[PDB]
Each structure stands twice: as C-alpha cells, then as structure tokens.
C-alpha cells in the first residue's frame, strides 16, 4: 500500500552522503514514482501540458520584459522593435500571445474532465480550492497583460473591466481609482499592471506546487468511482516511465499544432484593433474583449430588465442592488458556485460514467460554455439576449439544484469493483 | 501579568504591522501629479454648427455639438415619463428634472438653449465612448461596448446604462469660447 | 479569381520585384499624405524582402525630408538609421506601418483602392469635400441612402481620401504595364512587408519545427507501445 | 532524539479532516517546534535579519516598479516622480536602498559567526554550498540596482564591471556585447538589468528554502564542538516561543536603528554624483562603485607589476595570462577559495573558543577585511597599493595554509561535553 | 561660526519666510542661467515649504517661459502642472534641482556663492572669460599656481560663474537687510528645498517609528525575560 | 531494440531542448538596430588649436586635440624603450611602431603631422574616459578608475592599462572636417 520505495539511500558513498539534504529521495520515492492507475485514458495529460505552458510563458516573458518599456509613448515602439530587430522577436511574441490561449483552452479541459469523474467530490476538495485560486490569478494576469502593448483593445478593455469595480455602491469609485492610479487610464495604471503581470506567475507556481502536493497525497483521481485498494496492490503502476512518456507523446503532439498555428495562423485569435495605437477619443465597434472571457462577459450583460424573467424589476425592492451590481453579483456567483460544487453534490457515488442523467445534464452544460463563448461577441440585440438569459440560468441551475436532485435519484448503474479492469 | 504582557505585545505588533502596511496601499492612491485636475478653454470658433465638437480634458473627452432643429423637436417632445433618468445630470444646476431647457445649456451670455450642448461623452454604464453624429434607434449615440440609446439631449435609453451624460460646470466666454471647469 | 497573393500560403517568400515595385509607387504616390514610422530605412537591405543597394538607400534617406535630432535640436542628414517620415494632419491620412494587420489584410488595401467609382444613382450629387469608395466601411453615408432604420444601403462608404491613381501614373523600369490593378497589387505586397518583413523566416521555422516534433513524436509514440505491451496483449 | 512531535493531528475535526493537505504538520512539527540548543548567544540572530530584510526588499521594489520607467530619458524622471509625487515614496526608496546596506551587513556578520564556530566543517557542507551561491547572486542584484536610476556612478560602475568580462581572451568581448545589448552601455543594458534585477530575488526565496531545509535536517552549530546528544535531550528546548522571540527582540532594535538611519542619515552611505544626470562623455572622480564591494575592487586593482612580490611578470611565463585576466582570477578565487574552506580545514575540531591560534589569525582576518574596504576607495598610489597586496596575500594564505597546519597542531584546549553547559 | 540652518538636525521643518526670500532671489537672478525642471511649480502651495497663494503660482507660471507642448505643438499658455523651464547652453549653467545633495550640500553653495575676491598675488591678471572661486575645487588653475607635481596651491579654483550679487541687489517685502549673506542662505534653504521636499514628513515619521519600536522591543525583552527566568534563576 | 530506441529518444529530445534554448541567448545580443555602427562629420572649424575637442560615436567619445609644443617635444623625445604598448593601436595604417610620426594623424591632405591626433577616448583597462586638459605624471591624460597615466601621444603609462589609446580609420575633407567611419 502507497509504496514510497524510498531506496533506503543504499547505492553508493554519494547517495550516503546526501543524508545532509534529502532532495534527491523526495523526487525519487515521491513525484517520480507515485503509484498511478492503470484505467488511465488521454484526459489525464493535460496537467502536463498546463506545467509547461506556465514555464513556455514565464521564460518568453522574461525574455520580453528585456525589450518591453512600460509608457504610453514607447510600449508600441518597443513592441515593433521587438518584433522587427531582436533576434526572434515574433517568434516570442507569437509563442507568448497565443500560449495563453492554449494555457486557458487546456485548464478548460482540465476542468470539466474533472466535473466528469467527480474529481471535486471527496477526498479531493483542496486541490479543487486551490484550482479555483488559480484560474483566478491567471484570469487577473492576463487581463492584466492584454493591456501591455498599448494598442486600441487595450485601453477600452481596462476601462470597461475597472468600471466594473465602480458599480458596486459606496466603496466602487475609491476602489476604481486606487487601481487605476487616478480617475482614469493612463502610464500609472500600465506600470501596476507591467509589475503586478510580472509578479503573479511565481504565486501560481508555488500554487501549483500546493496543487501538486496535495493529488500525490490524494490519489489521482481514475475513470471509476475506485481507489487503489491500499492494503499488494498489484494495480497503480508508478509514474516513471510509463505515464511520463505517455503525456510527453501527448505534449508533442499538441505543441506541433501550436508551433503550427504560431508560423501560419498567429494573428487569427487576436484582434486586429490592436494594431492601431490607442485614441481615448475614440472607440472602435465590437471591442469583444477576448475569447477566455466572453462566458463572464454575457453573463454580465445579459441581466439587464429585458425579458419577462427579467429578476432585476423584482431585486429592485432593494433600492441599492441595481442592474450593474447584479451582474458583477452574477458572475462573482458563476465562478463561486463552480468553486462551492464539492459540497452540493449530495451523491455517495463518483464518475458520470455510471450516472446518465448527470451525462445529458453535464454535455448541455459543455454546449452552454460553447454558447456563452459564441453569445460575447454579438451585440445585445434580439434574439441574443433570450439565448444569454437562458444559458447563465441554465448554468446556475445546474451547479445549484441539479447536482442534489441526482445524489438523490439517480443510482441505476452498475459501480465497477477491482480498478484492474483487465476487459 | 502572563495574559496582560502576552496579548499586549500581540496588540503592539500588529499595530505597528498595520502602520507599515497602510501606505502599501496608500502609494497605489492617485498621486499629487493626478490631484491637479483642472479647467480647458475650448474655442467653438465656428466649426459648422450642427455637426459635432470632441475635445481632451482629464483624460476623458468633453463633447461640444450644436443643435439640429429636428434633433431640437425631437428632444423638446419627450415628456419626463418614459425616461430612466429624469435628473438632469449637468452640475452646473440642482437637480432639477431633467428638461431641455434646463439641460441643453447656458445662453452664451444671451438668452437662448436650444442651439448648444455640452456633455461628458463617457457612458455611465462603464465609460465607454458612444458614437455620435446621429447613431441609434433615438437620433442620437450608440455605445457599442453594451449596446446603450443615448436620445439627442443625451438621456440614457434602451440599454443597461443607468442615468443620462452627465453635463459638467461650464460657462461661456462671451459668445466664442467654452469653459470647461 | 480573388487575385491571390504569392505570400498567401505555407510558402511564398515575398517575390521581391513586385516589392520594388510597389517601393516605386509608395514614394512618388502615398508618401505625400501617409507616412510609415514604424519602419526604418535600413530595412530596404535586409533579406527577405527589397534587397536594395545600400548605397541607393543613403541617397533616398538623405533626399527625404529632416528629422531633426533627439540630443542637440539641429536640422540632420536624416540618415538611414532614423525612421520613414510621418504625416499627420492638415488633409493627411494614419500610419501604413501596420495597416496590413489592422485590417484579410492586404486583400482589403487592393479591394480598397480598386474602387473609387462615381456616386451612385442614390446621391449622385454626393458631398463636397469627401469622396466616394465601394469597400470602405467606415464612412459617413447620406440619409438618402440609409434604409429606415440607419444602416446603409451601399456597398461602401464615403472615405476622405481621393483617389490615388489613374490609367498610367508611373513608369516601371524592368518593363511592365503600369495599370491601376498591378500598381494596387505591388503596393499592398510592399505594405505587407512593412508590417510582416519576417514572414519567411516564419514560415521556415514553423516547416523545421513541425519535422522535428513530428518525428520525436514518432518515436515516443513506439517507446510508448513498446513498454505497454505486456499489459496490453491478451485482450 | 529529534523529538518532531508531529502533534498527531488529534485535536479536533478541523485538525483531522486538513488530513488531506499536511500543511499545518509541517509547520509545527519541523519549522516551529524544532529543537534547539540552549548555549545560542546573540550572534544567531541575523538568519531572521536577513529574511526580514529580503522581505523587505522584496516589497518596496515590487512597490517601485509601479513608477519606476526602464529608460535612458525616462528613469531619473520617475525616480524623482517617486520622491516627489508618490504618497511613501521617499521612504519606499531609501528603505530600498539602505536595507540593501543592511542586507549584505548582516550576511558579513552571519558569515563570520559561522567561520569562526566551525558551521563550515561537517556535517554542514551544503549550507556553507548554497550561501556562497546566495551571495553572488544577491551581489549580482545589488549591481543590477544600483544601475537602474540611470545617474552618473550607475553608468560607470557599469562600464568596469562589464569590462572585466572582457578582459579575459577569446570570449571577453563576445560575452561582453551579449551582456550590455551592444557594444557600449546603453537603453538595451537597462531593460537586462530591469528584469534580471526584478526576478533573481525569488531564486534566492528558493534557494532560501534549501537553506532552511538544510540546517533543519543538520543541526544549528551550538557555541561549542558538541551536538544535541540524541538518544530524552534535556537540552535542546525549542524554537518557539523562545528564540522566536529573542530573535524578534533584536530585530526590533535594528529596525530602530535602520529607521533612525533612514530618517536622519539616509543619504550617507550614497555617492552624491549619483543625484547627477549620466554624461558618457564626462567621467567623475573616484568612481568608488559602492562599500559591498570594495574588498574585490581593490584585490582586482592590486596586482599590477609594481612590487617585489609581484607575479605578475611570473605569471607572464605564459603571453595569455596578463595583469587583468590574473586580477579576475584572484577575484574569483577570493570567493571560490572561501566555498572550498570546509574541505581545506584538516582538523577534527570545531568551534575556535577552543583553538587560541585560531583565534589571532581569525581577528587578523576580520582586520583585513575591513581594511580591504577602507583601501578600495583610496588611490592606487603608494603606499596603498603594498597594503592592497599585503592584504590579499594574507586572505589567500589564510584561506589555503593556516587552516591545514591549524588542523595539525592545534589542540591545546580541553573540549566541553554536555551542551546543557549550567554554568 | 558654522552658520547652521534651521532644518540642520533632528527638526527644524523648513522655516518658509526664508524660502520665500529664497523664491524672490532665485527668479530674479539665478533662473537668467540655471532651471530646475525635476521640480514642479505647483509645489509652491503644497506644505512644508512655502505655502503660497495659488492664484500667485498660475500668475508667475503664466510669466514665464513657453513651454510648448506634448501632443500638438503650439507654445501654450505654460500651466503650473508643467515644470520649472531649463536654461541648457551658450552661457548657461546646471539644473539646481537636486545640486543640494550632488554636494554638507547646501554650506557648499553657501561658501561658494560666498567667495569670489579678487584674483590672488601669484596670479593677479587671472584668466580671460574666468573668474575667480575660493571654494569650487572642480576648476582650472594657472600652471603659476601650480606646485611641483600639478597640485594648485590655491584654496578653491576658477569657476565659469561669475559673481550673481553685489551689495543690495534686491529688495525683502517683509523688511529685511538684503546683503549677500542672507540672500545666499536663504537661496541655499530654497535650493535644499527644491531637492528634499518631504523633509520634515521624514523627520515626524522617524520619530514616530523610534518610539513604537522602542515600545515594541521593551514589551519583547520583558517577555523574554519572563520565558527565559525558569533557566537563568539557579546561576 | 531496447537500447537505440531509448537513446535515439533521448537524443531527439536533447537536440529539440537545444534549438529551443539558442534563442533565448541570441535575443540577448546586439540587436538590427545596434548593428548599424556607422560614421560622423566633426569640423574642426577652429575651436582654438591646442586644448581640445571631444563628440560622441559609438556610445563611446572621439577625442580630436590639437597639439602643444611642449606636449609635442615630449612626444617625440620618447623612445620605443620604456613604452609599454608600442604597437600604435591607431587601425588607419599597419602594426607599425608606436611612433609620434605614425601616431599623430594623417596630414590635412597636406604634409605635416605633428599638430593633430584624434584617438578613442575609451581607456583599455576597462573602459572608462581619461580627464585631459595636461593631467597625470606625464602631461597627458590621467584615468580616474584605477590610476593609469597616459602620455602625450596617447601611449599607455604607470598603470594597469595595457595598451595606448586606440585611434580609428579617419581621414580629412580638405583642411576643416573630420571623418569617423
Ligand atoms: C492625400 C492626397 C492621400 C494620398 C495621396 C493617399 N492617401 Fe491614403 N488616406 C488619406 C486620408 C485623408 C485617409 C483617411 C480616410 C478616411 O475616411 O478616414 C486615407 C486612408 C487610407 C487607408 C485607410 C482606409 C481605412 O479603411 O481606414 C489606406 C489603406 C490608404 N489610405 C491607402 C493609400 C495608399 C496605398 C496610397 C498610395 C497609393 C494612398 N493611400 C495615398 C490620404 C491620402
Ligand atoms: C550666468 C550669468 C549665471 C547666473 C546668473 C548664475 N549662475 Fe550658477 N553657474 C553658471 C555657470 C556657467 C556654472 C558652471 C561653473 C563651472 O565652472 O562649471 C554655474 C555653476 C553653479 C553651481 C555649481 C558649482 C559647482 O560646484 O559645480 C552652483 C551651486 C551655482 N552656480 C549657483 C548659483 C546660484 C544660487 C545662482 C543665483 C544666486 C546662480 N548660480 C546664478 C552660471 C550662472
Ligand atoms: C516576465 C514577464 C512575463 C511573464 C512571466 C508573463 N508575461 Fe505576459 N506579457 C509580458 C510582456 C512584456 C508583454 C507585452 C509584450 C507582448 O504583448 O508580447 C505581455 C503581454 C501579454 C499578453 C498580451 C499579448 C499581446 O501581444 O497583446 C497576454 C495575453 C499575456 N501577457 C498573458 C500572460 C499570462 C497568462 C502569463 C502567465 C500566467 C504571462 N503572460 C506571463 C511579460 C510576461
Ligand atoms: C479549477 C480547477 C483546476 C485548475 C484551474 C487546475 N487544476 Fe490541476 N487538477 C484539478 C483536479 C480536480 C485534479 C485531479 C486531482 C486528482 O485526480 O487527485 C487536478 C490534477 C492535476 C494534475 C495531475 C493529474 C492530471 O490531471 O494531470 C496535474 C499535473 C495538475 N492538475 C496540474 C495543474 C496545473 C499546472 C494547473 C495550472 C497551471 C492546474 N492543474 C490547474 C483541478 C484544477
Ligand atoms: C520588485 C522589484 C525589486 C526587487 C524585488 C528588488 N529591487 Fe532593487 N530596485 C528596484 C527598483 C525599481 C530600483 C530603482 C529605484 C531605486 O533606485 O530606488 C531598484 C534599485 C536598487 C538599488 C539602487 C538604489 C538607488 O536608489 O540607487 C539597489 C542597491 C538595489 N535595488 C538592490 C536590491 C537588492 C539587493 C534586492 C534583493 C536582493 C532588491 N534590490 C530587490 C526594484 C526592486
Ligand atoms: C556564505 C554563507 C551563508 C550565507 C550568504 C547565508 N547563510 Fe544562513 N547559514 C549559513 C550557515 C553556515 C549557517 C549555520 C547552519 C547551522 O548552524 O546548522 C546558517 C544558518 C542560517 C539560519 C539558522 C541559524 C542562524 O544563523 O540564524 C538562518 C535562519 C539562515 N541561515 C538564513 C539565511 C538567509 C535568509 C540568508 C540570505 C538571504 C542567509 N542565511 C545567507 C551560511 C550562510
Ligand atoms: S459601457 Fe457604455 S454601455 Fe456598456
Ligand atoms: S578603467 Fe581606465 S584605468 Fe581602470
């Protein structure tokens, strides 16, 4: 059972020596050879590629901020000299832009392979906690980032999403301005942002350092509602080599479509306004904020007193609980809700692979996320606000009623015994 | 005393902790250099009355526009039902209902409102830029980032927006000039 | 058809006469209005591109105008070191550094200025001072021409600039009919590689990548099903 | 013997369900309550120093970098901007700089308590490994700072500790252009040191780590030759709340004193000529590059051929060892010499309380080092440069005989036993 | 003797009727040559110094300079948000913003302002365009000066300044005698102000931050008496 | 087989980790933009023969002095013997010997050399700018870095310095310019 294997330090003079820092047996009989299930299929990579997307990201960054000037008057220049005369250039800027989309494309699939095989449900709420942590500081750097080149999106997406903080009553203006430096956008605001973007990183490293400690306490999770039956254990195969080379194969793969995406279609998943320097004298039409936000984004500007489930007339009784602040309320909710999921799901059961119901409710709620995405880019005009409606209440449907609803009726399958499902 | 000494060092250590803490959050704080926040003569200089006039002031924009007689009719026909925001916005005045008279502008010195309008082109809702010269589905601005209907004395309508363009304090210069602040 | 570009593809290394070409229009043409900031005048050197002699390059830098000095306020050479020149007001239009990228690109300056043709039978008389263009969209339009509820009813927009050129406005060196269509051709290439001179190198890098990768892919994927073969061979 | 004591997490449901993240176990089991000698004088006290003080650091840069802009034209600006403008500024600024003072005070002083109580001897080789590492690395971040406000000792201080690199054959000038951005000092030179400046103090966090991990696996030294005799440890109370509070009792009187300086002499420890715009045309007189680094200035600036124990026109045997390339070794060597001490000291011994003759070369040793510093700032005429190269020697000879011939006949001192020493 | 100032130790916040003296000498005469551009106008209502009347900062701002602009050039009106102009070159000086602390500082200009006598009897016909220092030590110095080894035997040395006062060159609005003495230290003061502004703030926080950490450290060394009495009672 | 395959993986891995480090420290070296290091016009146009004058190329100073008759009788009363660097590091001419004749400069497209040198103004030690104006033990040029003292062609003197000071390719334009480059 949990076989460490510490190695007892028995090879050699120099593995006795390292008696005086034990480094080398924590790798070894931990993060090396953790003992991991057979029943493993190609959901369980994307961790990998996640960790070194985030150490891709932090280099080319590093790399940047040596060319980058933080001003309003010399960030573009810095960018086009970046992306004309050093030595790789583009390729870095390319490489650091678009991984981003990768980063949050691959945590989209991380997460709802999760929600899937009950990944939240017990014993594995901390890692969950901490997941949430994550997307936060991660959503908050790349805002934060957007907004460094200085281009025309830039400006307008800081304004709206500081304006944002202004909603809320009593406390909105003071917090705006302490974060923009001043009343509104201007250098004070891209210097926070250049130090805050280049700060953050490190905290989610050493979350995921957090994240990694805890799933090596608490078994990874498998496609069946099993355990490793620890008590020898002929099941979980170590980590090293088998699992290892597998999610490398894996991460080749995926980085062989992003280096061709980077040399053929690098400007695709960005927007074009931001090429134009920025005027605060003019806006463009469909500043769209970006792609990783637009769920947020519609759930935010559906509620609005335009439909006849309209809930804002009636949070009206409350003279201070306006529209604005009920969206900020309602997207806050959409995120705290995901993150509260452990302790709504009232089911003594595990993987939706034995649970129906849960699979037709979790696939509308993939298509949902879809439909947010597609929705925040079209104007407010009908019939798109119906659709928007429809999705955030279905989401929120979902994460608070449905979950109960199934722990308590929804026990018609057949649990897998014997994680060796030698088929 | 064992308790006393205990919690009293406690109490002075965090004391000081806050103290040094404080101003990490007070240098974040607008600095004497943004505390300016001063007045801008913008000069009307006949720019073809009926159009549009933009002009930079604290970092947002100030918008200048004539009156267009249909634009005028338009906004002296709307009864203050049916409009979310019936305060006037403009600092210039109390908060008198928000009306044409009151809320197209001083007379440049003369006696006169319906030919000038002088508002903070900045969205209420999250300080977007509408587009003016004549956008929407009122004969006045659209802001694109939400989809807000500005009419033509600048009141909010059909849209998330709350309250109308604010109208900041400003008096004329003897019939060729604006000040603004 | 769609007049497809040499550049448009996983090849086409930016055939360097029709940049040259499009060099001769944008100086003698949209110099006098447009500027390109964001470029300097060494880069008519640098491969990939207009492969220029240096030399020639000195001569234009210093026969454009003065770009005065960042330490000591003196009217210079303009040496090739320092940047194109930049128009900005007074009847003059943006910065084409980037326009290219702005915009799919290239295709929207060719469809762009091929199209200034007379005001349609809608507003014949049109508008003093602005003239008329079919792919621009962001342009004023009559109310005699917007529908019931504001939108346009032409393909196009009504863009303050006039129109560039006419039947035979330059001569090409090498020998080549000068028409309006292979002139707008050129000058969009030579837009392109203002904003994208490191297009090749893109495209060269992206072909080595995608073989190694593939191929340490290839083998991973043996050591893969070579170490999970005796766990994988009775079913 | 080691008593961790891993409390057992019996004392209540929270304690019991955090089963799933250790945290809290490690905390109180290891970096709390970790058994420590009772025999600890006050010169165990500056590891606390030094971690406030990084932390410190750490925060008022992360501060500074919201005005500070990494330009020629540009830095001296937001440099004032802060002094100025900001709501702190003065005292981000000075509490920046100053503590980097006390920064490398504190190590000299960390370093030398650990020469003389035998910390480098075994078993605490790694500790003395990953110091050393330290140092250089905070050395190196300290020079990178003092370049950023672009004044005039900046740019110059700059220009000779870059040239060095290149005075070395083959590869000094290439590495040299590789390291300035260019051929001279310049835009491209600031935006390095920016970043580098803005990332190496989480490598020393880490690195940190690995020395608290260390000497937590290794026992802190104690004043004498002894260890805690494990096998229950009458000796040997714990950390908490002892010499937790102890150390926070001196850490108050030196944030006194640091403030007092701040408030009263803050501008002492600096060179006036960096209140002066840059001028690379005009250089001042003496340079002085700063007082943490006078030691190596002056023995690099000693060897010249100007002595009768010049080895110089030895070391000319070979025509590629020349004057400069023989001052960067002895640099070098300086330190490397200092990391290789735990391997060169041959004596079955410890602390120097029990070997007098140590106890005169140890004080002749402190001596030189001070006056090492006092002589980097004064002229390379006579008689300074025979003192410079007096002083050098006897570090080197120090270093590389007397530890060896100590080793050998050096025990004239009756050992004490029994580290509970009630005396 | 030393002439001490008034902010010349532990207090001493910037005694501002000496300032405003200083402003009166420093627009009048040292601003023909030097500038300070490190140092905004609006400063001359913010506390600690001299606290003027704003509507007299706008004023004087607007009777200065033009200072022309940052995105469209045009010589504006010249704002008190802008800074203080710069006098750069031909006949010109420094910037004074910060000469307080390139230097015990502000004695530096004070015994150099004070200092420019006559030419000393080892070379009485001096030098053409030079004048003659008694503290400045960054000068030239006649080789008749000169000792064996390059070393002048002068006390100072020849500065390119030449003497800015004689002995009323202007007049106090307080009432004041206005020799040269008192308008070089308070032309000193002002200078020193110019550079450390947030004097007295630092000196209130020192003395605020010494008491709560003295507080502090004797609460801890009560309490590690306490702990540590069990074990230090029998010895 | 067991071995090729597992190694030829490494390997391919190794090769990929490299193709990838390379950039990020070829980024780091002189940029187009440095790569330009071209030429300057500075007219000598009569600045008073004999105290100097100095203008920036290269990020580095370009020392253009006239000659003293006293400096210049030192110079050339200074035999090879005693001369540390008698290599004259002037680039426009051969290795030949670190002599006065050699060494001062080109003759203003005339016949005389013994009134102007132009050298860099860069000490080789480390780099710093020697103090001119008649310093040091030798009336020359005196570095305040480390105490090199230069003499009155430039040639290296009491000090670590190893070699003179260098003297680029320039030649003149007819008797009132100079060309750096
Ligand atoms: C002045 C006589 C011009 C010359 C000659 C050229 N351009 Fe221009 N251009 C000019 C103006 C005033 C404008 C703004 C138009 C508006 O309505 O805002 C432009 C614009 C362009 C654009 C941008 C179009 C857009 O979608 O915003 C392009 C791509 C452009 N012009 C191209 C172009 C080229 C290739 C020229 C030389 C052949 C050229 N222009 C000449 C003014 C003038
Ligand atoms: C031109 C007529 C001047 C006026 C009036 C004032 N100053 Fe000046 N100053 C001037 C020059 C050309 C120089 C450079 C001198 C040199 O030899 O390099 C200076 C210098 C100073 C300095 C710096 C001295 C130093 O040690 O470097 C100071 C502190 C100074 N001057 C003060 C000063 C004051 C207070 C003035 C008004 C009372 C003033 N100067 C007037 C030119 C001129
Ligand atoms: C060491 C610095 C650094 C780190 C670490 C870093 N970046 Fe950046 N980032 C930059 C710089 C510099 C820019 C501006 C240059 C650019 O846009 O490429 C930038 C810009 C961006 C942009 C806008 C790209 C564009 O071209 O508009 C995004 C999106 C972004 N960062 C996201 C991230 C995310 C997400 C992470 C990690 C979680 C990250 N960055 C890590 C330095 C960094
Ligand atoms: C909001 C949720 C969430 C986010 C965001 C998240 N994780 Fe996870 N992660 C999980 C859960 C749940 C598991 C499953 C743990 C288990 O099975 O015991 C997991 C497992 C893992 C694993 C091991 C198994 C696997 O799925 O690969 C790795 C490695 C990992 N995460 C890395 C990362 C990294 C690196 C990041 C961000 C840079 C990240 N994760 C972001 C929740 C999250
Ligand atoms: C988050 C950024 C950051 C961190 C971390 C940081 N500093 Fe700095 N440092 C700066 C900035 C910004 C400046 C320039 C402003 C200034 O000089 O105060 C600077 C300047 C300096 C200076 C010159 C001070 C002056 O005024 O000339 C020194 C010395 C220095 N740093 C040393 C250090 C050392 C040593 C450390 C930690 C080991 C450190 N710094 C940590 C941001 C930082
Ligand atoms: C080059 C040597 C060196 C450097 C630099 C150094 N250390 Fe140490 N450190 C030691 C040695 C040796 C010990 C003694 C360990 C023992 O007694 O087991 C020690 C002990 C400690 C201790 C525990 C006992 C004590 O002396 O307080 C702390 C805490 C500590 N170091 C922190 C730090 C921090 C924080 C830094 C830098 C930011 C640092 N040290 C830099 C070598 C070094
Ligand atoms: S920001 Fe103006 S409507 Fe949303
Ligand atoms: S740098 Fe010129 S002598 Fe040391």
């Given at each position: 059972?949990?076989?460490p294997?510490?190695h ?17 047996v ?11 299930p ?10 990998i ?25 010399l960030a ?9 005369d ?8 390319y ?5 981003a989309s990768?980063?949050?494309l ?36 790349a ?7 200085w ?17 809320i ?25 250049f ?18 400690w ?12 099993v355990?490793?039956?620890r ?61 990783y ?49 452990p ?22 709620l ?58 | ?49 009926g ?27 709307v009864?203050?039902?049916?409009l ?22 001083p ?11 002088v ?42 927006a ?5 109208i ?14 | ?8 593809g ?22 006098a ?75 929207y ?9 007379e ?7 049109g ?15 009559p ?24 039947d ?57 099903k ?10």
């Amino acid at each position: 059972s949990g076989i460490p294997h510490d190695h007892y330090e028995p090879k050699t003079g120099i593995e006795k020596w390292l008696h005086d820092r034990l480094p080398i047996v924590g790798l070894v009989y931990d993060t090396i050879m953790i003992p991991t299930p057979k029943n493993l299929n190609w959901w369980w990579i994307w961790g990998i590629v996640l960790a070194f997307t985030l150490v891709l990201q932090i280099v080319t960054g590093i790399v940047l901020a040596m060319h980058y000037t933080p001003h309003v008057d010399l960030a573009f220049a810095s960018v086009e000299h970046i992306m004309r005369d050093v030595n790789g250039g583009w390729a870095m800027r390319y490489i650091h832009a678009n991984g981003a989309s990768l980063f949050f494309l691959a945590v989209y699939i991380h997460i709802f392979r999760g929600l899937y095989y009950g990944s939240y449900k017990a014993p594995r709420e901390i890692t969950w906690i901490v997941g949430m942590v994550i997307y936060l500081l991660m959503m908050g750097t790349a805002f934060m980032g957007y907004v460094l080149p200085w281009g025309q999106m830039s400006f307008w997406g800081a304004t709206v999403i500081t304006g944002l903080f202004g909603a809320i009553p009593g406390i909105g203006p003071s917090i705006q301005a302490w974060l923009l430096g001043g009343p509104a956008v201007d250098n004070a605001t891209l210097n926070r942002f250049f130090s805050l973007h280049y700060l953050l990183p490190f905290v989610i490293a050493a979350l995921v350092a957090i994240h990694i400690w805890a799933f090596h306490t608490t078994g990874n999770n498998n496609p069946t509602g099993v355990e490793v039956r620890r008590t020898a254990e002929k099941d979980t195969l170590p980590f090293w080599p088998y699992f290892v080379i597998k999610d490398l194969f894996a991460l080749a793969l995926v980085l062989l479509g992003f280096f061709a995406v980077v040399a053929y279609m690098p400007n695709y998943l960005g927007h074009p306004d931001n090429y134009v320097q920025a005027n605060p004298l003019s806006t463009p039409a469909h500043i769209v904020p970006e792609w990783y936000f637009l769920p947020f984004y519609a759930i935010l500007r559906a509620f609005a007193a335009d439909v006849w489930v309209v809930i804002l007339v009636d949070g009206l009784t409350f003279g201070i609980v306006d529209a604005k602040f009920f969206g900020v309320i309602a997207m806050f909710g959409a995120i705290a809700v995901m993150a509260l999921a452990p302790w709504l799901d009232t089911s003594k059961v595990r993987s939706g692979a034995y649970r129906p119901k849960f699979r037709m409710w979790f696939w509308f709620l993939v298509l949902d996320f879809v439909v947010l995405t597609w929705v925040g880019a079209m104007p407010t005009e009908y019939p798109y606000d119906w659709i928007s409606l429809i999705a955030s209440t279905y989401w929120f449907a979902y994460f608070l009623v449905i979950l109960p609803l199934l722990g308590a009726t929804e026990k018609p399958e057949p649990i897998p015994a014997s994680i060796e499902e030698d088929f | 005393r064992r308790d006393f000494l205990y919690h009293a060092t406690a109490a002075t250590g965090v004391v000081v902790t806050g103290a040094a803490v404080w101003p990490l959050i007070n240098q974040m704080n607008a600095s004497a250099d943004v505390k300016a926040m001063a007045s801008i003569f913008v000069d009307v200089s006949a720019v073809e009355v009926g159009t549009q006039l933009t002009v930079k002031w604290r970092g947002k924009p100030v918008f200048i526009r004539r009156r267009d007689e249909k634009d005028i009719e338009l906004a002296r026909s709307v009864p203050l039902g049916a409009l979310r925001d019936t305060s006037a916005e403009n600092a210039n005045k109390p908060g008198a209902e928000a009306t044409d008279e009151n809320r197209t502008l001083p007379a440049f010195d003369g006696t006169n409102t319906g030919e000038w309008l002088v508002m903070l082109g900045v969205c209420t809702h999250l300080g977007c830029v509408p587009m003016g010269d004549k956008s929407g589905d009122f004969g006045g601005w659209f802001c694109p980032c939400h989809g807000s209907h500005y009419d033509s004395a600048g009141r909010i309508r059909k849209g998330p927006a709350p309250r109308n363009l604010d109208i900041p304090v400003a008096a004329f210069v003897d019939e060729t000039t604006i000040k603004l602040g | 058809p769609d007049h497809a570009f040499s550049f448009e593809g996983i090849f086409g290394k930016y055939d360097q006469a029709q940049l040259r070409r499009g060099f001769q229009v944008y100086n003698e043409v949209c110099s006098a209005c447009h500027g390109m900031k964001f470029v300097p005048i060494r880069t008519l050197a640098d491969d990939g591109g207009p492969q220029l002699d240096p030399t020639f390059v000195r001569e234009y830098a210093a026969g454009l105008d003065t770009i005065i000095d960042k330490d000591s306020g003196e009217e210079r050479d303009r040496k090739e070191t320092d940047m194109f020149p930049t128009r900005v007001g007074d009847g003059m239009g943006p910065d084409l550094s980037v326009m290219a990228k702005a915009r799919g690109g290239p295709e929207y300056i060719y469809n762009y200025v091929i199209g200034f043709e007379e005001n349609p039978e809608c507003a014949p008389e049109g508008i003093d001072g602005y003239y008329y263009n079919k792919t621009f969209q962001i342009g004023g339009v009559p109310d005699t021409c917007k529908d019931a509820a504001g939108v346009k009813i032409t393909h196009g927009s009504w863009a303050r600039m006039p129109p560039p050129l006419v039947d035979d406005q330059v001569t090409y060196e090498d020998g080549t009919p000068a028409t309006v269509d292979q002139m707008a051709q050129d000058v969009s290439a030579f837009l392109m590689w203002a904003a994208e001179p490191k297009l090749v190198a893109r495209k060269q890098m992206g072909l080595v990548a995608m073989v190694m990768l593939g191929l340490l892919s290839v083998m991973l994927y043996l050591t893969n099903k070579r170490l999970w073969a005796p766990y994988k061979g009775h079913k």
